[PDB]
């Protein structure tokens, strides 16, 4: 199931990158690690806006929000410009708006948000006690291995939501499309003190169909684009001849 994989050319481009961060890719049953640390996989981490997915899920399932409903810009300056405007949630998660994703956990409330993440299992399904910033500075953590498989189920629509929930989260997770290849997903990055974790985890839709998911995570830095995920992301995904 878990195990290392063929490759000292993903390891390299790591390196070439100047960072610590692992790959898990998982098809079917099988899940492979690449990258220049490993051990990353086995280690949680907050899942910053990569919670997005979940919080979609949660609020669509329970009737808090609906694919149509226009999130309104109250007119407040905010931490990016691109945010300063109405949106759907599915524009939010594109934009990865935090401003929604809070007023929606809100909506949603502490009871039902803990409920449904014990019962997701969803990393350490720990969301305390603050309901609208528990995924970006914990306590809620998770680990690259988790992650692949819980977008692994939303590919497959083996989450334990219902079918058109599903559908509907997995039609705004939409980032490129070419060849008849298309990859869906979602990033996420938490400035701690400690070190920043960057994320990307989504999944590949090759042309007959088949799935292939993945879960990027590596240490970032300020200094770094945030175009850097996508890069390193597409290069190992043609390495490994998954594009
Ligand atoms: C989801 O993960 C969100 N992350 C954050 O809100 C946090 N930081 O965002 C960065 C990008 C570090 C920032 O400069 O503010 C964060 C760190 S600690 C905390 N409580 N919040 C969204 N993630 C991203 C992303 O993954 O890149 C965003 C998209 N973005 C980033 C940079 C430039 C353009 C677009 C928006 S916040």
Redesign the pocket.
């Known amino acids: 199931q878990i195990v290392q994989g063929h490759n000292q050319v993903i390891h390299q481009y790591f390196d070439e990158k100047n960072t610590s961060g692992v790959l898990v890719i998982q098809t079917d049953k099988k899940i492979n690690l690449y990258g220049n640390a490993l051990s990353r996989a086995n280690t949680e981490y907050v899942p ?3 919670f997005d997915m979940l919080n979609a899920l949660i609020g669509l399932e329970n009737q808090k929000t609906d694919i149509n409903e226009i999130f309104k810009w109250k007119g407040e300056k905010r ?2 410009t691109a945010w300063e405007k109405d949106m759907t949630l599915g524009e939010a998660m594109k934009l ?1 708006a ?1 401003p929604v994703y809070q007023e929606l956990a809100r909506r949603i409330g502490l009871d039902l948000m803990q409920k449904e993440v014990k019962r997701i299992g969803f990393g350490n399904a720990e969301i305390g006690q603050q309901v609208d ?1 528990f995924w ?2 914990g306590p809620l953590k998770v680990t690259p291995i988790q992650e692949v498989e819980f977008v692994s189920q939303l590919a497959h629509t083996q989450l334990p939501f219902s079918e058109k929930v599903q559908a509907n989260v997995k039609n705004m997770l939409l980032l490129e499309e070419s060849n008849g290849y298309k990859i869906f997903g979602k ?6 003190i400690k070190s ?1 974790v ?2 990307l985890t989504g999944w590949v839709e090759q042309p007959d169909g088949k799935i292939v998911a993945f879960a990027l995570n590596m240490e970032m830095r300020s200094e770094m684009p ?1 175009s850097i995920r996508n890069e390193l992301l597409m290069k190992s995904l043609k390495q490994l001849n998954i594009i």
Not at 187 to 192: C, H, I, L, N
């Open positions: 910053a806006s990569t931490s990016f990865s935090v910033n970006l500075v990033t996420g990055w938490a400035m701690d920043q960057g994320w945030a």
